[PDB]
């Protein structure tokens, strides 16, 4: 009965723990010891973007490192231009409570979603010249927390139902559903080759998926609170994860372990966003103490502080060419650092 | 270089045409209030898909009223998106024990880190069953709460004519039970407003109107150091 199944699960857990312990002999710190330090770094807010009424939950960059899109709870989806500080489009929304935003890689479509349980696709290339709804996707039973484009016809969505979904915009139906989590899944990120993706949830675990087969391959547990944001290492063989216990972690796919933890005593808030730079040497982290930190990914030392915001930091992003960093907060502003 | 000038001119025109309507929407947005309904005859109160939305006006003042629908029961993460709402209308029935669960929910929503500015309008529903049932001798209040045996009715109670002393004792005990948590924590930023309500009635919208008036007046008096 249930007791026998629990005993079998315990036996497999012990076997996996032993298999992980066998493969580990030396820590990453014992290797990255004699390498030169990165030194102090400084960044100045050489931009400021104004015009929202309420706070900001989500922003997303573009392919050309020029245009970004931002979502606000006054019911507005704004497309900006980082160079000349101009607004190109300002989409109204039928639902005021939005929580996520996404920009398609072809530059033709934008996505939106929130507490209405529906993912909406907005078209930007219209003969009439008006930006209207092109498709509404409604098959979820909980709020949408993150969505990302694959092509102009496929989308991946994440909800508070403990599920993830793969859609098909042309037809309007779900193709595959991923169900392994026990608590709300908060964020997800796509691998460079569009074959796999990792997700983090409110049960203090990260999971690895496959897009075609639809099965889960790896589960990682090293935290003590809820997972909030996640992102791949640019190589595609590691990823960094952030939680609400004032620590960040680095995980590897080849060894099924955690290599390094980032935490300092004067840090007692949570962590709301994470991102990697181009070369994998720096790790950015946004905090609830109204501050942004830059860590060295190979020594775990506080490489710099960015302090210019007056409220909680929610969204953070880095361009594809590694030029600038963009930060949003609950004061209805976006800043472009460098 | 003419093409660059044309592009810059087009972009500036688009920006201006957008900003005008942004300002109009600002003006329309600022003059509307927002309320979160949470909890219990919700249909009774409202009469008198994740979100159900209701719009109404009293004395040419406009309100938005938001009720959560198709959602789970984990409130940890979607309760933050109501940081700036002017009032949480909390409906609780006064009659497992539901009341102690309501107490724990109130304590959690009161002490949260992002909700230390929001105020709570409390509704204590089911007055008829609160009065009729207790006269039969069913000790619903003496056993669940063992502090009730030595509670004395306060000096300011003003019951409606014909009320039994036991009924008013029970009502004021419940109200004081809710009002113990509110005073201990909030240091002048946010308050709690109690209101007895009936299943058949027509005066709840006026109560919400007056309470919103009071909260906004209190905030303005607070910024100038008068209060």
């Amino acid at each position, epitope marked *: 009965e249930l007791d026998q199944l629990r005993q079998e699960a315990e036996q497999l857990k012990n076997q996996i723990r032993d298999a992980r312990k066998a493969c580990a002999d030396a820590t990453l710190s014992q290797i990255t010891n004699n390498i030169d330090p990165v030194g102090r770094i400084q960044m100045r807010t050489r931009r400021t973007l104004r015009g929202h009424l309420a706070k900001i939950y989500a922003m997303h960059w573009g392919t050309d490192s020029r245009l970004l899109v931002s979502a606000s709870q006054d019911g507005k989806l704004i497309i900006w231009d980082s160079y000349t500080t101009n607004k190109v489009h300002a989409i109204p929304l039928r639902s005021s409570w939005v929580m996520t935003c996404a920009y398609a890689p072809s530059g033709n479509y934008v996505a939106c979603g929130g507490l209405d349980n529906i993912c909406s696709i907005y078209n930007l290339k219209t003969r009439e010249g008006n930006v209207r709804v092109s498709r509404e996707l409604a098959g979820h039973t909980g709020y949408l927390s993150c969505c990302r484009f694959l092509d102009d016809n496929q989308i991946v969505t994440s909800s508070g139902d403990t599920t993830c979904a793969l859609w098909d915009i042309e037809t309007g139906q779900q193709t595959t559903t991923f169900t392994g989590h026990t608590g709300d899944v908060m964020s997800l990120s796509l691998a460079p080759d569009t074959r796999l993706f990792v997700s983090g949830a409110c049960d203090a675990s990260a999971k690895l998926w496959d897009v075609r087969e639809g099965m889960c391959r790896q589960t990682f547990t090293g935290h003590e*609170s809820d997972i909030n944001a996640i992102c791949f290492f640019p190589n595609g063989n590691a990823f960094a994860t952030g939680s609400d216990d*004032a620590t960040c972690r680095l995980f590897d796919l080849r060894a099924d372990q955690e290599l390094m933890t980032y935490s300092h005593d004067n840090i*007692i808030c949570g962590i709301t966003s994470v991102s990697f730079s181009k070369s994998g040497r720096l790790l950015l982290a946004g905090y609830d103490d109204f501050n942004c930190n830059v860590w060295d990914a190979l020594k775990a030392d506080r490489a710099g502080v960015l302090a210019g915001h007056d409220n909680r930091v929610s969204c953070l992003g880095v361009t594809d060419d590694g030029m600038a960093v963009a930060t949003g907060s609950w004061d209805s502003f976006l800043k472009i650092w460098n | 270089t003419e093409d660059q000038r044309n592009e810059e001119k087009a972009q500036r025109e688009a920006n201006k045409k957008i900003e005008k309507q942004l300002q109009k929407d600002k003006q329309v947005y600022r003059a509307t209030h927002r309320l979160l309904l949470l909890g219990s005859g919700k249909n009774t109160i409202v009469k008198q898909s994740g979100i159900f939305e209701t719009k109404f006006q009293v004395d040419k003042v406009n309100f938005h009223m938001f009720d959560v629908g198709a959602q789970r*029961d984990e409130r940890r993460k979607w309760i933050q998106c109501f940081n700036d709402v002017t009032a949480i209308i909390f409906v609780v029935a006064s009659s497992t024990n539901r009341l*102690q*669960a309501a107490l724990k929910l109130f*304590d*959690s929503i009161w002490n949260n880190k992002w909700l230390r500015d929001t105020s709570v309008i409390l509704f204590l529903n089911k007055q008829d069953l609160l009065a009729e049932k207790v006269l039969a001798g069913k000790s619903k209040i003496e*056993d669940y709460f063992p502090e009730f045996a030595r509670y004395t009715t306060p000096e300011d109670a003003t019951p409606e004519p014909g009320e039994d002393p036991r009924v008013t004792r029970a009502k004021y005990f419940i109200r004081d039970e809710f009002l113990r948590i509110s005073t201990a924590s909030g240091d002048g930023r946010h308050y709690c407003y109690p209101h007895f309500t009936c299943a058949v009635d027509t005066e709840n919208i006026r109560r919400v109107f007056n309470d919103c008036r009071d909260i906004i007046q209190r905030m303005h008096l607070r910024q100038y150091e008068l209060l």
Partner: nanobody
Amino acid sequence: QVQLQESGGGLVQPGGSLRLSCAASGFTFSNYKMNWVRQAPGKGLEWVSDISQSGASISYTGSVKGRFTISRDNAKNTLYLQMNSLKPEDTAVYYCARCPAPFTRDCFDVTSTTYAYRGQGTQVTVS
């Protein structure tokens, strides 16, 4: 990994006494606030009692006030519940729950189905 094990329990004669233990591993026991919950046959989940970080703020539900006691040990990472003078109404499964975040003053969902940081529980019976 966040693992919580419960020890003690079983059948106890009415008007008796019992002791229950909760051992936790996978997190810093001294940064979190802890509580107990129960779940009866045919009924939902219900709150019992709790303890703060240091051990100063102790609360109770009211239907067990003065009869049960709760205690906390940090050097051994173990939380205790002592039960006295039982009754036929006190038969249910008992769970040892932890609030979702450190250094906090409140926690929302410890009495909701499908919550992460909750143990398997123990069975106590009074007859």
